[PDB]
Amino acid sequence: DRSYAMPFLSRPPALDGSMAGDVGFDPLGFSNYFDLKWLREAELKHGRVCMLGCLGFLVQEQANLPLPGFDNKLATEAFFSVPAGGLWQIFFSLGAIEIITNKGKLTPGSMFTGGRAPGDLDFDPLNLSVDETALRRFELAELKHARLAMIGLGGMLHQMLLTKQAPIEQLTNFKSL
């Protein structure tokens, strides 16, 4: 009756095998006090953002549209170079899809009323998971990459801010201190 990830701590009651990312790690025990469907959806959404964000840090940093305000490698300082005009029409593009995928249901008291499982916006163009085993291994892979990419954009961004150097550059230069 003890958490696997926190041997010393007892297992969170809510956390369970069924989740697909459970390793018993909820030391705070947020699970006990929020809809775990909402928490999983938030985890997967943040991770799906960050998984693209780290690669962006990296691709924007090497290649870039040849448009005039699109070429500025340090991503942190790039957000402002490209005009907010563009950044806003994209923000609006993500709004459309937020409401498209979530199908209007986009509040904690309404999002999952339609029976949608957390973290699924019904997207599965490739790497099909009809195989529960495949779904079972792919969900753990997705959760691990979500969790890793969180740390990533975090570091890349805070680090790009710390040394005004994009990801690949910083480490190679690695001006320390």
Partner 1 sequence: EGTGEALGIDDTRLIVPVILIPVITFILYAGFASEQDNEDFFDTYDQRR
Partner 2 sequence: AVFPGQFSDSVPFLKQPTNLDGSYVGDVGFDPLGFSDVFDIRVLREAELKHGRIAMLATLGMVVQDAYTFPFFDKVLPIPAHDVIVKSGGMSQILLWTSFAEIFGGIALFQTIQGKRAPGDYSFDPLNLSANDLEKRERYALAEIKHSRLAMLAFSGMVHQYFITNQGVIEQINNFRPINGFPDATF
Partner 3 sequence: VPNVPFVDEITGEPQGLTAPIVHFGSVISLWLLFALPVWSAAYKAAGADTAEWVGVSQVTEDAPGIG
Ligand X SMILES: CC1=C(C#C/C(C)=C/C=C/C(C)=C/C=C/C=C(C)/C=C/C=C(\C)C#CC2=C(C)C[C@@H](O)CC2(C)C)C(C)(C)C[C@H](O)C1
| 8 A C-beta contact, residue 145 and residue 47 | yes
Binding flag, residue 127, partner 2 (CB under 8 A):
yes
Query: Of these partners, partner 2, ligand KC2, ligand 8CT, none, which one is at the site of residue 82 (CB under 5 to 8 Å by kind)?
Result: ligand KC2
115: left (phi over 0), alpha (psi -120 to 50) or beta: left
| 8 A C-beta contact, residue 166 and residue 160 | yes
**Beta carbon of residue 31, minimum distance to ligand X (angstroms, whole number):** 24
| 8 A C-beta contact, residue 26 and residue 125 | no
| 111 or 153: CB nearest ligand 8CT | 153
Helices 36-62 & 132-162, crossing angle to 10 degrees?
Answer: 60
Per-residue mark of binding to ligand CLA, 3-32 (x: CB under 6 A): ------------------------------
**Beta carbon of residue 124, minimum distance to ligand KC2 (angstroms, whole number):** 21
**Beta carbon of residue 107, minimum distance to ligand CLA (angstroms, whole number):** 6
